[PDB]
Amino acid sequence: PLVVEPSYPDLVINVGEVTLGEENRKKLQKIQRDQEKERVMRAACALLNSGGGVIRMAKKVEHPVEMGLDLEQSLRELIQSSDLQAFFETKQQGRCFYIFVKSWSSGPFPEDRSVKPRLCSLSSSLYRRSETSVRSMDSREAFCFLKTKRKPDPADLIFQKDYLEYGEILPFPESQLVEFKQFSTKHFQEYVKRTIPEYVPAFANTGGGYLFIGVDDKSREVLGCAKENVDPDSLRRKIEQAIYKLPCVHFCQPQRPITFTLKIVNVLKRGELYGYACMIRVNPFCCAVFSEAPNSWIVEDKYVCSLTTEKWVGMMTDVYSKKGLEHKKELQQLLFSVPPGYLRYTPESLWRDLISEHRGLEELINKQMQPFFRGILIFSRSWAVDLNLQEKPGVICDALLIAQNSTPILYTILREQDAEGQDYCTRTAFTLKQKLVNMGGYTGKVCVRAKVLCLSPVSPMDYPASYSLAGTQHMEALLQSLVIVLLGFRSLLSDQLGCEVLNLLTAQQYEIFSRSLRKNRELFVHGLPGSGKTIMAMKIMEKIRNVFHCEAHRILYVCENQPLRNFISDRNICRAETRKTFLRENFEHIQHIVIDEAQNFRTEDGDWYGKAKSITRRAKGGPGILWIFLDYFQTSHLDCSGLPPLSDQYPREELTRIVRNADPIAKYLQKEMQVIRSNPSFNIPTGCLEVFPEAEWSQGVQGTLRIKKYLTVEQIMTCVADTCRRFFDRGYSPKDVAVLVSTAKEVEHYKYELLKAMRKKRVVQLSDACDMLGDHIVLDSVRRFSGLERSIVFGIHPRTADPAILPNVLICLASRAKQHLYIFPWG
Amino acid sequence: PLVVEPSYPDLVINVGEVTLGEENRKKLQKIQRDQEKERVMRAACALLNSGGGVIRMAKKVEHPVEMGLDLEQSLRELIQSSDLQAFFETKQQGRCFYIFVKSWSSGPFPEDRSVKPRLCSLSSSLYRRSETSVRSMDSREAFCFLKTKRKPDPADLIFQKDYLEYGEILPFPESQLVEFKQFSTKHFQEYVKRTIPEYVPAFANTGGGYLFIGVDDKSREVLGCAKENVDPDSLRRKIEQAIYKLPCVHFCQPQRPITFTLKIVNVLKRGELYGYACMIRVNPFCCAVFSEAPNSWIVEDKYVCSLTTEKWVGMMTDVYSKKGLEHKKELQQLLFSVPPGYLRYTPESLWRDLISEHRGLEELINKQMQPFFRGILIFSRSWAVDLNLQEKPGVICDALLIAQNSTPILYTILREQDAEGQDYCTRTAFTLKQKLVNMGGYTGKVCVRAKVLCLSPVSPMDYPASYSLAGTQHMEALLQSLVIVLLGFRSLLSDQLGCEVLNLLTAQQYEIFSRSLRKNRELFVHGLPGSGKTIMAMKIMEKIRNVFHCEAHRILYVCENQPLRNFISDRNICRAETRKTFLRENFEHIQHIVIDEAQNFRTEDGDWYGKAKSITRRAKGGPGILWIFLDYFQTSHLDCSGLPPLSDQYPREELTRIVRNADPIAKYLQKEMQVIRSNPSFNIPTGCLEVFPEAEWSQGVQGTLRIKKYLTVEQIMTCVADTCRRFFDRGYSPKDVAVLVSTAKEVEHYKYELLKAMRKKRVVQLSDACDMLGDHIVLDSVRRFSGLERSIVFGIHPRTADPAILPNVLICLASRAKQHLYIFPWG
Ligand SMILES: [Mg+2]
Ligand SMILES: [Mg+2]
Ligand SMILES: [Zn+2]
Ligand SMILES: [Zn+2]
């Protein structure tokens, strides 16, 4: 059989000695020539169906030869096109001849799913009657036929006769429904055994028909066979055995077998019996009938294996990120934009960390990157772990190079020379290349080279020039498949792409929401947890100054909490003040007002709503903009907020799509929101919590959620400290992490005890929520962190004075986390 | 040549005498066989590209015969599939053999428009190099190739040599870029003539290449040709002319010819000159190169004609209603709903008129329709006029039968028998069948039979059974293609289908607009003329009743004009009253208030806006719905309306898409709306008229708009009577017509005057604007018709006391017409 050889970062199949050249292949016998051709075509079909590769064959001569006309024509039949260069390219060196095969279909969701078949075959074994002939369906014809089947006569008079006269003339000719076959007595049982599999499936696949055996084709004479050789009882058994042996695949209930009527009639000569005539009526079949298993091949594990009939039909009729496929062009420009003129190293934070730890690493990389003047060099502490492979001790970092006028190269950097290092780098380069096609949907010609570098001071296959990245179009198309591949795994770059997907979902919802500015002057925005309520408020104030041409100091932002005030005030889009500041000072110059977390406001210090209404209505442009953002699920107290009654809060906009938290976090939010509806707080209005999320809305972003309980406070700190160190080793920055506790008075206690464990991790710098621009882990209370968000959030000991508000802190805490949430409840 | 036979309701081509049967065709000489096959495939390709038809051929035999393996294979190559039954079906009676051909691609906008090619060809004349061979692209390959071209070496070392030794071995073999031709002196000039169109277009179409002439293929020896026979200057000219003769098609600029380098070199034997060798380097071409004109055929008028190279490329790369195609299933189910169990005659209104005017027509139609038990019989006074053909005097009516277990039949009824009757029906049945395919996009097998019936007391082909209508699915699909065909013509059923497209457009805009009910309690709707403002107001009251679960009498509709008030009351969706009635009577029982035509309201009777707010705010469910509909383009007076200032009219909704008027009416409104912007009325606030229609919005419904000026009052009424008589004769109803005058005081004058001219047209009854349910023509003033609408409107002398309000009168008049508007301005 054929075996893929594992000394290469690709699928390489050795077919052995092959005769090449047309004059050399002519001199061969038909048997040997056909065996060689079939071996080469099995290898080519396997590589077409398995994501591409190289066919290695040994030629018997030194001088360059052509491949041969029969091999060319078989490849043309294999891809159903004369454009043989699009999928095949040939190289030869001395005694070895290479065919580089490109993948037929790429990705789980190709752009041609309903157009082109997913598989190539040597034969589909699907035949149909085509007027007076039987033709096998090619891959496209078989694809259309199975698509059709999956969707939810003068000849009968002769068939009704009980006997036939010898030499009788049949009035009808051969047609779409009639086939005449002459029955020879020397091999009659063998002849009928091979006639059945080729004409019965053809009739059943198209409208049925009549098969007459014993009728001369040219003269239409009924002759039959010798009476002494044919046994009508024995002949019947052979025919029915062959008909029921034909493989059948059903797309329907019931699954009744093939239906036919077989009649053996006597052929009478001069009134005396001369022999028997075999007549078969084949009824049309509900589904596809195969004469045998399809001749399609695929590579699975280390062997070249043939697809079974049921598996072949499955692929011919039929983590993957839909968001990654949709936004792949936007995502690539954000993270993997290729700069013209120089080579870019990403991630830059990880690159600085690596060169600081390892002396001479920067010179090793820089000396290697001299030939390449444009592209990107993507670093990772282990690209194997990023692709769900095994971590190798001794590997410093893995770098993937995507540069112009070069093939992709995977660099594995070792601290010391290792024998198994080459196998580790080849296995990772193989996995990456296969993911780029079968997962990233790359439809071009791709190869990833495996190179090992050592810090301490098998031959490489030569691919055609079409495998080198020619320019920006090739590099961008390849990097857009890496975006899709990365988003299906858990890694730093996967998390950096996941954050940007959440930013694109928010930007999509904002454009729908931003259309309300023209239609409204006063608006109440009832946005669900995780719906981007604060992000929309920031973007609206950017649109207000653009649309109304007012200055930034003419727009006022009012919020309850100081950390959220500081975050907004640092953006320089408006003036940001606290409710207590709002009631005290005078804001007569303000034209537009945006109020956020208004459900957290309090009446004890004055009527803030009347003042906000008064300022905007007396403004120059009639009633100025007064938009009030609130979330009744995140109420922080049982006091009266000062908002108008729920029936007076009109007009309304509702943000029901969760677009700021990953899929595990979002599902936790909907679960906890259902608990609130089952027991709403008394201060909250009765029907406001009846706002439900979208019926079926998903983010398409991977996330993390673990709930760890019954741990002591000291054990809690060690779990937080160990988790952060693992995050920071892979390249995560400390400014992606927040630690949120129940109350602000416990912030000082937990800060000391966390710093006690975190000092062992070379991290002794912690900040509160009032500072979010520094590169430090923020530790503060859940309520004081309102409106802010971090990628990684640790929830430690949720608590409140009244258990009625207790389910709120879980919603308030979980909505602060974008991708990773760790909860440590009381026990 | 091949000529279309004109006596049939289909494209019929007679190819004459053809030998059929495999044994009969094998006995023929090759030239005769190929000529007959080529004639048959010319006919088949023409019918495939021209909407389908029948190939008529006379066979040299009486008994039934098969068609022949070469003919079968040629048809399979023509359609690129072994499914020969889907496009070709054969019949024979006596000495005639019929091939029934289905259309390859149907409709201007096929579903596979971006997938499958539009044309079938016997050859594309597009060759490309496929490794060491030249292969022609079939229709799918050429389609993809032209799509790709549309978007925006060791052999070089030998090429640099100036002289070559006789018998020198070339190191490289034949490949994708290298071809060797052996050059014989007997036909050396003739050989060059043929080799250039074969290999140069193949190289130019795929990446260029090298063509060496004078090198043996098998041994790669440089031989050249005899020095005595070759003229190197003459030989160079011959090659240059042949390359420039190749037809080229450009999808770009510039359009330079084929770039190549031709080199003639000397062949030296034993140090002595032996002859010359020709080496040609072909650069890749920017676009498609043809070896000759494509072999594709089409039917134009009564001839079978071949497409030119530029016309073939145009079809392969590249009144029709967009709205009709998208709504074809809903439009079909509205008008042409097929009933199970009985045969339906449509239209009922036209059918009653026909049987009353003509004695014995009812029994004549019922006698013919007895074999048909399920289907629809579509009547018209002249189906030829509907399809832009000339009317025939003496034709009572035409009917199109679409029934189960039958082919479509077009019946023409004559009052006396006529020789030209059968020619008139056949030309209409031919035109209808070609429209159903080429315009309505029917992808099935269709034939329209032409039958002529006489009221006063060539042979049709027997089509295959696959041309009959088997059941509901075949009948519905054909009726959906008739909807698309009818909407592209001017006829009764076109206007009934055009009105329903307007109702579907209005229902689409309401679904967008009805989402504001959950968000707003008080809302101001600023709709444009023709935006469906009164239609939305009625539909909202249905949703108010359903959403708020209040009964109908709790909803109040307030308008300014009595005729609009009675229109709303007749639908029983609310309580509907006028402004004066609203201010007088008590409405404490009212919860929700909808106000329409609010710009026409007046202040002197009281403060209606405050009363509306008071009633709605004091409702049980807090603030009730208070929606106010208004358009400042239909402002009928210059007084104060009582509306709050434009700055206080928030929240605001705008209906900017025109969905109630046909395209000629819609375009007139936009032009007239532009005049109002340049001269706003003083009573309208400054920023009101700045509402602009949708950037690019079209109705996709065709209509009529004519201006007839300088006519006298007596002349005007005769034209109205003549136009109304023409509409009613064609089957329109009087309730589709309104005659609108400038002032209500002149209504009594024009009513008597019109009745004087209209009595000759056999109706002596007119109805007022307050009565819309009667089947009578409505005559009143423009102002009293506000909020109402008719299909046909005659506008007579638009006039007002102030020329400032005059330009609105054209808007208030034109927007009342859905499809047909006739204006008679002052002279
Ligand atoms: Mg046969
Ligand atoms: Mg050759
Ligand atoms: Zn089945
Ligand atoms: Zn060009």
Residue numbers in the entry:
A (entry chain B), B (entry chain A): 7 to 158, 188 to 353, 381 to 519, 530 to 899
Provide excerpts from the study:
It is recruited to stalled replication forks in response to replication stress and inhibits replication of certain viruses such as the human immunodeficiency virus 1 (HIV-1) by modulating the tRNA pool. SLFN11 consists of an N-terminal endonuclease domain (residues 1–353), termed Slfn core domain, followed by a linker domain (residues 354–576) and a C-terminal domain with homology to superfamily I (SF I) DNA/RNA helicases (residues 577–901). SLFN11 forms a homodimer with the helicase domains adopting an autoinhibited conformation.
The SLFN11 dimer exhibits a ring-like structure with the individual protomers interacting via two interfaces. Interface I is located between the N-lobes of the helicase domains and is stabilized by several salt bridges (R590 to E726 and K591 to E725). Interface II is located between the Slfn core domains that interact in a head-to-tail orientation and is formed by mostly polar and charged residues (E78, Q79, R82, S88, R134, T138, S139, R141, E147). The endonuclease active sites are located in this central groove in close proximity to interface II. In the apoenzyme structure additional density for a metal ion appears at the proposed nuclease active site which is coordinated by residues E209 and E214. This illustrates that in SLFN11, ATP binding is sterically blocked by the ID-helix. The SLFN11 helicase domain appears to be locked in an autoinhibited conformation via the dimer interface I and the helicase-linker domain interface.
